[PDB]
Amino acid sequence: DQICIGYHANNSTETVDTILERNVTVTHAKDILEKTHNGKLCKLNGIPPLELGDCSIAGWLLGNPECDRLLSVPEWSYIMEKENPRDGLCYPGSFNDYEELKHLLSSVKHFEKVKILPKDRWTQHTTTGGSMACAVSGNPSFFRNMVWLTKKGSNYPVAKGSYNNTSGEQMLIIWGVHHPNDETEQRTLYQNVGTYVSVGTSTLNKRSTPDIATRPKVNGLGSRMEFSWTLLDMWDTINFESTGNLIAPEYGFKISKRGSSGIMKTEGTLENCETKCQTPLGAINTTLPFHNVHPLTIGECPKYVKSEKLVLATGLRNVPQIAIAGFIEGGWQGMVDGWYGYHHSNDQGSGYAADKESTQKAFDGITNKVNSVIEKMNTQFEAVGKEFSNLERRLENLNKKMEDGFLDVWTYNAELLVLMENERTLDFHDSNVKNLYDKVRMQLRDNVKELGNGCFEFYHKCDDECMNSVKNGTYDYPKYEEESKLNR
Amino acid sequence: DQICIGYHANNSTETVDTILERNVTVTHAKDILEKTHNGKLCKLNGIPPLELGDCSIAGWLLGNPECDRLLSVPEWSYIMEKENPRDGLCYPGSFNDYEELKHLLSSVKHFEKVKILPKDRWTQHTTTGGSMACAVSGNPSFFRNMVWLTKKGSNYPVAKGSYNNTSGEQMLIIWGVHHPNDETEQRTLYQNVGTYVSVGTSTLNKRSTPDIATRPKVNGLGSRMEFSWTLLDMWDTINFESTGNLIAPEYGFKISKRGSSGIMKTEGTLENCETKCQTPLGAINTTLPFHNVHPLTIGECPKYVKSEKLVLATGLRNVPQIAIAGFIEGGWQGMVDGWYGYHHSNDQGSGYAADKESTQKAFDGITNKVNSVIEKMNTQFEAVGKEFSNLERRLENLNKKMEDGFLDVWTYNAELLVLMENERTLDFHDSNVKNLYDKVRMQLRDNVKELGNGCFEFYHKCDDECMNSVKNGTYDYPKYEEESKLNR
Amino acid sequence: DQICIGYHANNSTETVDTILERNVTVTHAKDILEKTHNGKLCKLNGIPPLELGDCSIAGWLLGNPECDRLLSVPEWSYIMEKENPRDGLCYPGSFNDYEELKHLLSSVKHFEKVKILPKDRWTQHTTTGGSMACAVSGNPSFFRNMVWLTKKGSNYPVAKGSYNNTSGEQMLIIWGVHHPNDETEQRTLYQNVGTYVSVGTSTLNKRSTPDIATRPKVNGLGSRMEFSWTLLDMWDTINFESTGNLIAPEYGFKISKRGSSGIMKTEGTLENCETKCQTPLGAINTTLPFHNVHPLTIGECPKYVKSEKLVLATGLRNVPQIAIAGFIEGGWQGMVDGWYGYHHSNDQGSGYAADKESTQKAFDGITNKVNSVIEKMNTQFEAVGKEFSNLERRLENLNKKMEDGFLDVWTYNAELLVLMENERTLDFHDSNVKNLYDKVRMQLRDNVKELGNGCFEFYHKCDDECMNSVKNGTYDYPKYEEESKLNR
Ligand SMILES: *[C@@H]1O[C@H](CO)[C@@H](O)[C@H](O)[C@H]1NC(C)=O
Ligand SMILES: *[C@@H]1O[C@H](CO)[C@@H](O)[C@H](O)[C@H]1NC(C)=O
Ligand SMILES: *[C@@H]1O[C@H](CO)[C@@H](O)[C@H](O)[C@H]1NC(C)=O
Ligand SMILES: *[C@@H]1O[C@H](CO)[C@@H](O)[C@H](O)[C@H]1NC(C)=O
Ligand SMILES: *[C@@H]1O[C@H](CO)[C@@H](O)[C@H](O)[C@H]1NC(C)=O
Ligand SMILES: *[C@@H]1O[C@H](CO)[C@@H](O)[C@H](O)[C@H]1NC(C)=O
Ligand SMILES: *[C@@H]1O[C@H](CO)[C@@H](O)[C@H](O)[C@H]1NC(C)=O
Ligand SMILES: *[C@@H]1O[C@H](CO)[C@@H](O)[C@H](O)[C@H]1NC(C)=O
Ligand SMILES: *[C@@H]1O[C@H](CO)[C@@H](O)[C@H](O)[C@H]1NC(C)=O
């Protein structure tokens, strides 16, 4: 009569890496890294994005004639923009604090256009000026949301205009200053030399003077237009005054909604979907702590790591080979009912089994360790990504270094944690079998002999009741002791 | 006669968490996280703070008439400032590079005030200007550290003034420029149109021109005052020149004491206690390495972590179940001297005893582990807190991201380290008791029988000396060899 | 006959550290921290650095007459600059966006000077101006790369000049503006009052006006010169227009070679040596994953840490004390050909031995462990170092805190890794010894007699062949069953 102690084997081919060994085959393993996406630009939480197309943010806000589909935009989840958009400032020039405006737009999620300075209030000036650089069907035209003020007859009176913010929320207002190319242009347009543009609010006070100089021709013109912006608080007034060279606004943008959005640089087009995490390469759907798709993401994206594989072992070391022997020379292939167990062979018959308590304890411990690895990762809405001008390179380098350093730290953490946990799991699984063997030996004592392969041979003829007794942990030594002596 | 080996149990209810199990009761534990404070603001290292009250930094430095209690301030340890102070710039305007000034103030103490340009030197101008914005007792007044120069009679000559820094340290100087509301006011005050203000040092060169424009009324006025500041090096000269619109300084601030300080944003007052660490919610008096009261802190203080429980296990599991059995069926409450020990039952009596060597070894190891975890964290004077303007949102976001990332990293590190160390300790203890059992078994050999519960049964008569020898490592096996053979 | 199981010992003094113990003497160790340099400034990958001597970047680019040895420089790997260079701006003044220019130079490895505006083209002005501040041999002189335009006769016509970038790469152009002291100087030099300097490209539009004011004398002059720089893209035109106070450029710097570089702040001199990693104190020659020489490296260098000692244990603990005993009493000094082995004393002499499979497995495990710890850290060209102005203190503090936090995190990670792995390996060796002893005991069974010191005493007479069979896992129990049963 024999009883053996051993573990379970199967036909798995998964491998994990420990700190002491490489490419160790295991019976059960879990991949905790997702590497797949659907390659589609999709709607986030049921709200479609704002597809700018070939239009920049400045072109959309200023009302470029080639972005006329954006004159009334609904609520959006994020903004899709191209790397080098073609339809921006049709009239050459510059935009002050452009990156700050984009950062502000990264948390807006909806706008409302309000007419604040109607084009017909300027009864002493000409408000029908246009340039060929913003042409529409071969005729001169200008930005849709702005007004160009020009002399009426041969006079340019002082132009004054004010607006009191009764809309109900904060407002964004954009104005501009025109820089001519020569004195003749200035005289033709405004009749005066030495002009100014003054803008004033409760917390803003700005005065500007045009610069007249010859410049290289961009879009055919040597002139430039410089645009500025401000945020008007509730129940506040904005004042305008100019003796020339003022591109006054006609509309203001009220911030209706507010939340978590972003500007993502892609060249794609929207297609029907419904997602939660969006990447400039596609959409994601998983539950694992890490991925390796793209650093700059938007949504419920778990964590970006610079690693190609992260597999956690939750099963046995797969040694296939097994007068059935025990755990000295490998596991068993026919015991598909659990992790650890016993094998008995008496006159009635042979058969496998499983130790329920030890298997359940190991299962609970392994599951708790896996859930501790996965569950302790703090996740928040991080629409990372910022833009800097060409006069701010130290800031850009600082941001890049910060992101790369954090990425390296988390990659190192993931790798070392996975390796160390794999080694402890594989050691603990063998310690459990050793403890089972030790407990059986201690509760059996001298009525049995050891064959050295993990099995015990019985001096006393053991029936299935005795097998259940030893497996159950209730063995009465002073019953067969007298009988076991005689045959020993 | 019997000897048994087992561990020690008590009535503790403390609970620790491991990477494999939750809610595990232990005999001893150590808390390394501070979660309490005083609720009070008081002195740091014997030096009281500077309580601004309803005053701002600019209001204190410029001499707001409502802040006259701060005309002479002794040495301070830190500055207490409200979130939205009421008494700042009584005359509406702006302050250039305000946040840089606050950052400089985060490392300065005392600020001895010296008179650089006496008010009576301006013999060719009028120095008694005032406004109803800064009104005392119903009469017009002005800032106490500045001079408002106006026309004497009907003339405003060129105003010139210089100072040489022969004080002994760096000096902070503030000057302003007036922006009127209309040309009539400019003519009434300064009699000229087309004025300028020029300030120059060996490293500075600034020229300003007034701006005349209608503006929304703040504090009843449509005019503004713009202030700028500079740091004057030792043995350096500052030159002033103005045809009009100059607010000259009368006093300069000398940096007397330099050190580690900060600005605390609180709405509370100062009470009479003393501490070596201060948080906006209260003071921390502790020696523990961590705390979770508040991120922003001033003084030498423990690190901050976003956790609610950090407990180190320093003792065995509390399994209280107890012919007395051994370690296999749980611990003993009869052991009141050590962690691992013995129990003997001879014919002269019985009782409990402790093994001093193993207990001392395990105690030293656990103390080393605790001190290694605690002492491998470096803390210094960390003044978390900085101010940013409206047009610096990207920098504020960068600062917030950096702080949050580092705090998250350290919280993760502390939690995982505590979990792993707790699991290691719980395995250390049972390894130690098993080692003691195996040592005694090897020393005793075939003179005894193993009962399967951690107890031995002797084949001879173990008196007090015999049992003491077993407890000492000096068991003389050959003495009782032949005797034990007969009984077997 | 008698066979014992033990481990190897020697006369090593090296001590490693664990989390439970300190100063543990081990047989073999491995230091993964580098602490030595050569105290020399050397050539990086065979390319010598650019030695500025006592000059600054501004003095070299502007053409300081005291920096005439740098009028034509070859390729370089990095730039060596003093903390406080003596020869910078000989004429007192400032330099707009100086730190940005230095950061740009941190990624440029060569320049090619191109003559864009020849000095003889100004046929309507005088181009022979100089000052005694930039004096050569007692005569007035000026910057070598700049032209000082001055009235010819009694006239200063409008000065116009343009350049089209057909060189083949981006070009760096520097111009300047002169600020006189009094009006008499302005009339003497330029004949006009109310002048302007206009500079314009496709993306740049700048206009400046001279400031005339009395200022403290620096280098004997109250006048100043303000310098600005720009980057001209390929096939782009720059325009200069001025009615006075223009310091025109004569040369343009074309970016010939690009790469990863930096600026080293040192007071030393280049020596005749090569290197691959360079620190301000000296070069580093190592193949290790850590160092503590200097953080401001330039090149492919190991990671910096504030650790003073990082030693991994690769061998066994040193317990040097041993008829012959086994592994309980201590280590063996005689055994030299392995880690775990035997000792046999039969009738044909005596001697030690060394198990092969166990030593091979342990050696492979430790090798994989050290390789995993070392080859997990990413090292690339990370030449660090940035400059900030006196009005950018918040940015400087931000950068410093970022670097300090990252380095503290990495130091913690390295220390924890080494401290935990040392415990793991020191327990691994003991487990291996015990497993070998248990395997021998299990395959020997009842024919032997354990003595409690790690040694098995035989019953039947066993020759060298039988012991060799025992050591090779082929001992036949049935062969000696009859003889063993008799003596037992
Ligand atoms: C492990 O297996 C992979 C293939 O699955 C192979 O690329 C790699 O080199 C192997 N590593 C070792 C150490 O054998
Ligand atoms: C702007 O409108 C609000 C509400 O209608 C009013 O209280 C406020 O006085 C107005 N502003 C001015 C400058 O009149
Ligand atoms: C006991 O553990 C469970 C998780 O298994 C946890 O939810 C519970 O809070 C713990 N008990 C206490 C008192 O916290
Ligand atoms: C300022 O005073 C110091 C001595 O206190 C003197 O050396 C220096 O020349 C003075 N400054 C000027 C501009 O004269
Ligand atoms: C027990 O060991 C101690 C060791 O200090 C020794 O002094 C004492 O004599 C020993 N007693 C016996 C009975 O062996
Ligand atoms: C370990 O050795 C170092 C010097 O090698 C010494 O400074 C330290 O105090 C020692 N520690 C202990 C616990 O002996
Ligand atoms: C500059 O040179 C390029 C190439 O020769 C030419 O295409 C371009 O038109 C030139 N610029 C101007 C303004 O003529
Ligand atoms: C650097 O170290 C290597 C050993 O790996 C040695 O061969 C070489 O000569 C050393 N070079 C210098 C410059 O010290
Ligand atoms: C082990 O060595 C013995 C010599 O005693 C030899 O007879 C046997 O074949 C060897 N076995 C193996 C597997 O090398």
Report the Cα A60 to chain-centroid distance in Å: 27
Contact check, Cβ <8 Å, A214/C378: no
Numbered residues of chain B with Cβ closer than 8 Å to any chain A Cβ:
19-22, 94, 179, 211, 213-216, 218, 224, 226, 328, 390-391, 393-395, 397-398, 401-402, 405, 408-409, 411-412, 415-416, 419, 450, 452
Beta carbons within 8 Å of A337's beta carbon, 6+ residues apart: A8, A352, A353, A354
Residue B257 · residue B123 · CB < 8 Å: no
Torsion, Cα of A402, A405, A410, A416 (10° steps): -170
For residues C150 and C180, give the distance between their C-alpha atoms in angstroms, rounded to a whole number. Answer: 13
Beta carbons within 8 Å of C194's beta carbon, 6+ residues apart: none
Percent helix, percent strand, percent coil in chain B, to nearest 5: 25, 30, 45
Q: Which CATH class is domain A50-265?
A: alpha beta
**Tokens representing A61?**
């806000």
In angstroms, the first-to-last Cα distance of chain A is: 14
**Tokens representing B247?**
């607010």
The residue written with tokens 């167990």 in the block is A341
Residue B282 · residue B40 · CB < 8 Å: yes
The closest alpha carbon to B246, from B318, B311, B161, B328, belongs to B161
Q: How far is CA C285 from CA A38, C32, C37, C291, C425, in A?
A: 48, 13, 7, 11, 29
Q: Around Cβ B435, how many Cβ atoms within 10 Å?
A: 12
Q: Which of C13, C17, C21, C23 to mutate to test the pocket of ligand 6 (most atoms within 8 A of CB)?
A: C23
CA distance, residue C402 to nearest chain B CA (Å): 7
Report the Cα C109 to chain-centroid distance in Å: 18
In DSSP terms, A152 is beta-bridged to: A155
For residues A169 and A166, give the distance between their C-alpha atoms in angstroms, rounded to a whole number. Answer: 8
Q: Collapse the DSSP code of A311 into the 3-class scheme (helix H, G, I; strand E, B; otherwise coil) and give the result.
A: strand
Q: Collapse the DSSP code of B488 into the 3-class scheme (helix H, G, I; strand E, B; otherwise coil) and give the result.
A: coil
For residues C367 and C363, give the distance between their C-alpha atoms in angstroms, rounded to a whole number. Answer: 6
CA distance, residue C282 to nearest chain B CA (Å): 28
Find the helix packing angle between B98-105 and C393-444, rounded to 10°: 60
For residues A179 and A162, give the distance between their C-alpha atoms in angstroms, rounded to a whole number. Answer: 24
Report the Cα A191 to chain-centroid distance in Å: 56
Q: Residue A165: which region, alpha, beta or left (left: phi > 0; alpha: psi -120 to 50)?
A: beta
**Tokens representing A70?**
């954006």
For residues A262 and A122, give the distance between their C-alpha atoms in angstroms, rounded to a whole number. Answer: 38
Out of A19, A216, A450, closest to residue C237 by CB:
A216
Residue A415: how many CA atoms within 13 Å on its side-chain side? 20
Provide, as residue numbers in chain A, all residues whose Cβ is less than 8 Å from the Cβ of B409. 409
CA distance, residue B386 to nearest chain A CA (Å): 17
The closest alpha carbon to A324, from A358, A354, A350, A355, belongs to A350
**Tokens representing A356?**
């329920």
**Tokens representing A257?**
């909604």
Q: Which ligand number lies closest to the CA of residue C463?
A: 9
Report the Cα B333 to chain-centroid distance in Å: 43
Residue of B100, B241, B372 to mutate for C, most C C-beta atoms under 10 A: B372
Report the Cα C98 to chain-centroid distance in Å: 25
**For C2-34+287-487, CATH number?**
3.90.20.10
Torsion, Cα of A74, A78, A80, A81 (10° steps): 100
Find the helix packing angle between B393-444 and A98-105, rounded to 10°: 60
Out of C231, C241, C369, closest to residue A20 by CB:
C369
For residues C398 and C272, give the distance between their C-alpha atoms in angstroms, rounded to a whole number. Answer: 38
Helix then strand count (H, E) for chain A reads 7, 30
The residue written with tokens 């494999």 in the block is B20
The residue written with tokens 């190592």 in the block is C286
The residue whose CA is least distant from atom 7 of ligand 2 is A235
In angstroms, the first-to-last Cα distance of chain B is: 15
Dmax over Cα atoms in chain C, in whole Å? Answer: 134
In DSSP terms, A282 is beta-bridged to: A279
Q: Nearest 5°: phi and psi at A60? A: -65, -45
For residues A347 and A399, give the distance between their C-alpha atoms in angstroms, rounded to a whole number. Answer: 76
Residue B147 · residue B122 · CB < 8 Å: yes
Report the Cα C224 to chain-centroid distance in Å: 40
Which amino acid type is present at position B165?
A: N
Beta carbons within 8 Å of C348's beta carbon, 6+ residues apart: C463, C464
Q: How far is CA B211 from CA A199, B131, B200, B222, B376, in A?
A: 11, 19, 21, 12, 59
Q: Around Cβ C409, how many Cβ atoms within 10 Å?
A: 21
How would you classify the pairing of strands B2-7 and B455-458? antiparallel
Overall residue count recorded for chain C in this entry: 488
Cα A124-A126-A127 angle, rounded to 5 deg: 115
Residue B316 · residue B429 · CB < 8 Å: yes
In DSSP terms, C203 is beta-bridged to: none
Dmax over Cα atoms in chain A, in whole Å? Answer: 134
Q: What is the resolution of this structure in A?
A: 2.4
Which amino acid type is present at position C77?
A: S
**Tokens representing A281?**
């390469």
**Minimum-distance ligand 9 atom for the alpha carbon of C469:** 5
Residue A32 · residue C377 · CB < 8 Å: no
Q: Judge if the beta carbon of residue C164 lies within 6 A of ligand 7.
A: yes
CATH superfamily of B49-265: Haemagglutinin, alpha/beta domain, HA1 chain (3.90.209.20)
Q: Residue B146: which region, alpha, beta or left (left: phi > 0; alpha: psi -120 to 50)?
A: beta
For residues B295 and B165, give the distance between their C-alpha atoms in angstroms, rounded to a whole number. Answer: 40
**Minimum-distance ligand 5 atom for the alpha carbon of B474:** 14
For residues B467 and B475, give the distance between their C-alpha atoms in angstroms, rounded to a whole number. Answer: 9
Scored b (16 or more CB within 10 A) or e, C439-459 reads: ebeeebeebbbbbebbbbebb
For residues B88 and B82, give the distance between their C-alpha atoms in angstroms, rounded to a whole number. Answer: 11
Which amino acid type is present at position A228?
A: S
Ligand 1: which residues within 6 Å by Cβ? A 22-23
For residues A159 and A150, give the distance between their C-alpha atoms in angstroms, rounded to a whole number. Answer: 10
The residue written with tokens 């098995």 in the block is C456
**Minimum-distance ligand 3 atom for the alpha carbon of B23:** 1
For residues C242 and C230, give the distance between their C-alpha atoms in angstroms, rounded to a whole number. Answer: 18
Q: Nearest 5°: phi and psi at A421? A: -65, -40
How would you classify the pairing of strands C41-44 and C270-275? parallel
Go through chain A and list every residue after which a break occurs, taking a C to next N gap over 2.5 angstroms, comma-separated. 322
Residue B189 · residue B151 · CB < 8 Å: yes
Sign of CA dihedral A410, A412, A414, A416: negative
For residues B419 and B16, give the distance between their C-alpha atoms in angstroms, rounded to a whole number. Answer: 9
Residue A118 · residue A163 · CB < 8 Å: no
Q: Judge if the beta carbon of residue C394 lies within 6 A of ligand 6.
A: no
Q: Collapse the DSSP code of A173 into the 3-class scheme (helix H, G, I; strand E, B; otherwise coil) and give the result.
A: strand
The residue whose CA is least distant from atom 1 of ligand 3 is B23
Experimental method: cryo-EM
Residue B47 · residue B75 · CB < 8 Å: yes
Q: Which ligand number lies closest to the CA of residue A165?
A: 2
Q: Around Cβ C351, how many Cβ atoms within 10 Å?
A: 13
Report the Cα A479 to chain-centroid distance in Å: 68
Q: Around Cβ C29, how many Cβ atoms within 10 Å?
A: 17
For residues B32 and B309, give the distance between their C-alpha atoms in angstroms, rounded to a whole number. Answer: 9
For residues C457 and C464, give the distance between their C-alpha atoms in angstroms, rounded to a whole number. Answer: 15
For residues C70 and C64, give the distance between their C-alpha atoms in angstroms, rounded to a whole number. Answer: 9
**Minimum-distance ligand 7 atom for the alpha carbon of A216:** 13
Which amino acid type is present at position C361?
A: K
Nearest CA in chain A to B307: A376
Provide the residue ranges of all domains of chain A, joining segments of one domain with +: 2-32+310-487, 50-265
Torsion, Cα of C50, C55, C61, C67 (10° steps): -90
Nearest CA in chain C to A211: C207
Q: Which of A116, A163, A164 to mutate to test the pocket of ligand 2 (most atoms within 8 A of CB)?
A: A164
Provide, as residue numbers in chain B, all residues whose Cβ is less than 8 Å from the Cβ of C412. 376-377, 413
DSSP assignment of A138-156, as one string? TEEE--SSEEE-B-BTTB-
Q: How far is CA C70 from CA C52, C61, C65, in A?
A: 8, 9, 10
Q: Nearest 5°: phi and psi at B364? A: -65, -40
Scored b (16 or more CB within 10 A) or e, B77-94 reads: bbbbbbeebebbbbbbbb
Residue B187 · residue B263 · CB < 8 Å: no
Q: Around Cβ C399, how many Cβ atoms within 10 Å?
A: 19
Long-range contact list for A82-88, CB < 8 A, 24+ apart? A82/A52, A82/A53, A82/A54, A82/A265, A82/A266, A82/A267, A83/A265, A83/A267, A85/A52, A85/A54, A85/A55, A85/A56, A85/A59, A86/A54, A87/A53, A87/A54, A87/A55, A87/A56, A87/A59, A88/A55, A88/A56, A88/A58, A88/A59, A88/A64
Which amino acid type is present at position C297?
A: T
Write a three-state SS string for chain C: CEEEEEEECCCCCCEECCCCCCCEEECCEEECCECCCCCCEEEECCECCEECCCECHHHHHHCCCCCHHHCCCCCCCCEEECCCCCECCCCCEEECCHHHHHHHHCCEEEEEEEECCCHHHCCCCECCCCEEEEEECCEEECCCCEEECECECCECCCEEEEEECCCCCCEEEEEEEEECCCHHHHHHHHCCCCCCEEEECCCCEEEECCCCCCCCCECCECCEEEEEEEEECCCCEEEEEECCCEEEECEEEEEEEECCCCEEECCCCEEEEEECEECCCCEECCCCCEECCCCCCEEECCEECCCCCCEEECCCECCCCCCCCCCCCCCECCCCCCCEEEEECCCCCCEECCCCHHHHHHHHHHHHHHHHHHCCCCCCECCCCCCCCCCCHHHHHHHHHHHHHHHHHHHHHHHHHHHHHHHHHHHHHHHHHHHHHHHHHHHHHHHEEECCCCEEEECCCCCHHHHHHHHCCCCCCHHHHHHHHHHC
Which amino acid type is present at position C405?
A: G
Contact check, Cβ <8 Å, B408/A376: no
Out of C200, C369, C399, closest to residue A398 by CB:
C399
Residue A286: how many CA atoms within 13 Å on its side-chain side? 21
C276 Cα–ligand 8 center, Å: 11
**Tokens representing A190?**
């405004």
DSSP assignment of B398-435, as one string? HHHHHHHHHHHHHHHHHHHHHHHHHHHHHHHHHHHHHH
Q: Judge if the beta carbon of residue C472 lies within 6 A of ligand 9.
A: yes
The residue whose CA is least distant from atom 3 of ligand 6 is C23
**For C48-268, CATH number?**
3.90.209.20
For residues A451 and A442, give the distance between their C-alpha atoms in angstroms, rounded to a whole number. Answer: 16
Alpha helices in A313-355 (DSSP H): none
Residue B414 · residue B290 · CB < 8 Å: yes
Q: Collapse the DSSP code of B29 into the 3-class scheme (helix H, G, I; strand E, B; otherwise coil) and give the result.
A: strand
Residue A34 · residue A291 · CB < 8 Å: yes
Q: Which ligand number lies closest to the CA of residue C22?
A: 6
Q: Nearest 5°: phi and psi at B343? A: -150, 125
Q: Around Cβ B202, how many Cβ atoms within 10 Å?
A: 17
Q: Judge if the beta carbon of residue B23 lies within 6 A of ligand 3.
A: yes
**For A2-32+310-487, CATH number?**
3.90.20.10
The residue whose CA is least distant from atom 2 of ligand 4 is B235
